Amino acid sequence: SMPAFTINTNIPQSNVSDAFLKKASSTVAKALGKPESYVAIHVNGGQAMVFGGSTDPCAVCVLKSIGNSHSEKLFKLLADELKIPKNRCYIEFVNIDASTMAFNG
Amino acid sequence: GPGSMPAFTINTNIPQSNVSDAFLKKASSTVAKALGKPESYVAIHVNGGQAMVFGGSTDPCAVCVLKSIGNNSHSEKLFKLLADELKIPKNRCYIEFVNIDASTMAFNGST
Amino acid sequence: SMPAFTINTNIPQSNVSDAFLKKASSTVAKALGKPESYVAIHVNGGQAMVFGGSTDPCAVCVLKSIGVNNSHSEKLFKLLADELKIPKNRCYIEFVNIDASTMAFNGS
Ligand code: NA
Incomplete structure (x- = not known):
């Protein structure tokens, strides 16, 4: 399984550097406590968004995983790197197939 | 900090240059009114210029999701938005309404 | 309902041919055993991805259906690798079945 951070933004895509992409990959890997080899980042820029x-600059994002500290870092990453006001950065953290944990003695 | 935003995403193969500022304003208003919510709580994302079947x-089409955390007149209002403003035939518009984390409603006799 | 195969990739969309789209449409229709008239293919290319x-060429995909996948998974991986020229070890596919947790039967 690969946790995936998707960023949808109306910032022109030319403002999304590879340096930012790597910084986001490392931030996500550290936040989830998982190896970077399993992390996927997808920035969809230049989008038509409200x-x-x-329609002012914004980011609508989802961090999807199957099954805190660095999460606020994800917000700062978006605001500082993409130059989006923090109140227009939105992230949904989605945990799929994670409703039940079972224990035997 | 915490708080959910209903979001209408339109995936379409029409060029993104055909996505006007007026259309975005109208889509935001239409979704907000369909959901009976202020426009300040709504997100719109038109992902155009996609390679789609x-x-x-491969003719013009739209595949859309209205996502909320926690719908028939609403569906026709959205289909009207698509067909009339983006000029996509209704028979090539598809919309899924997804309600996340909404399986269970709890009541106490006190309530 | 319409099953939908979404491909997010950093290869430019100019490398996503109509032939590839039609072949992907057919592959999905046969794999899910549903008419092609209800199948949707969406390739979101030119994306900035890690x-x-x-950042080398890669693809992250979802095959979503509302309401087996091992054999068809290899067909989709081969399709991605051969047609879009993405190494298989950099193709990732999630098969998502929505609203499919419970099947109920009466003994009749
Ligand atoms: Na926060």
């Missing part, structure tokens, strides 16, 4: 009624 | 054809 | 720490 966020709260405004 | 819809029922075996 | 896969396992590298």
Whole structure:
């Protein structure tokens, strides 16, 4: 399984550097406590988006995993690297197939 | 900090240059009114210029998701938005309404 | 309902041919055993992506259906690798079955 961080933004894609991509990969790997070899990052820039009624710069993101500290770091990463006001960075953390944990004595 | 935002995503093979500022404004308003929510809580994402096949054809189409955390008139209002503003035939528009984490409603007799 | 195969890739969309799209449509229709008229293919190319720490060509995909996958998975991987020229070790596919947790039967 590969945790995946998807960023949808109306920032022009030319403002998304490879340096930012690697920094995001490392941040996500450290946040989830998983090896970077299993992490996928997907930045979809230059999108036509409305966020709260405004088309001003924004980011709508999902961190998807199967089954805290670095999460606020993900917010700062978006705001500082993409130059998006923090109140227009939105992230949904999605844990798929993670409803049940079972223990035997 | 914490808080959910309903989001309408449109995936389409029409060029993104055909996605106007007016259309975005209208889509935000239409979704907000369909959901009965203020526009400040709604997110719109039009992902155009995609390479798509819809029922075996590459003709203009739209595959969409209205996602909420925690719908018939709404569906026709959205289909009208797509067909009238983006000029995608309704028969090549597909919309899924996804309600996340909404399986269980709890009541106490006190309530 | 319409099953949907979504491919997110950093290869440019100019390398995503109509032949590839039609072949992917057919492959999905046969794998899921559903008519091609209900199948959707969506390739989101030219994306800025990192896969396992590298920005080399890669593909992250989801085959979503509402309401077996080992044999068809290899067909989809071969399709990605041969047609889009993405190394198989940098193709990742999630098969997602929505609203399919429970099947109920009466003995009749
Ligand atoms: Na926070």
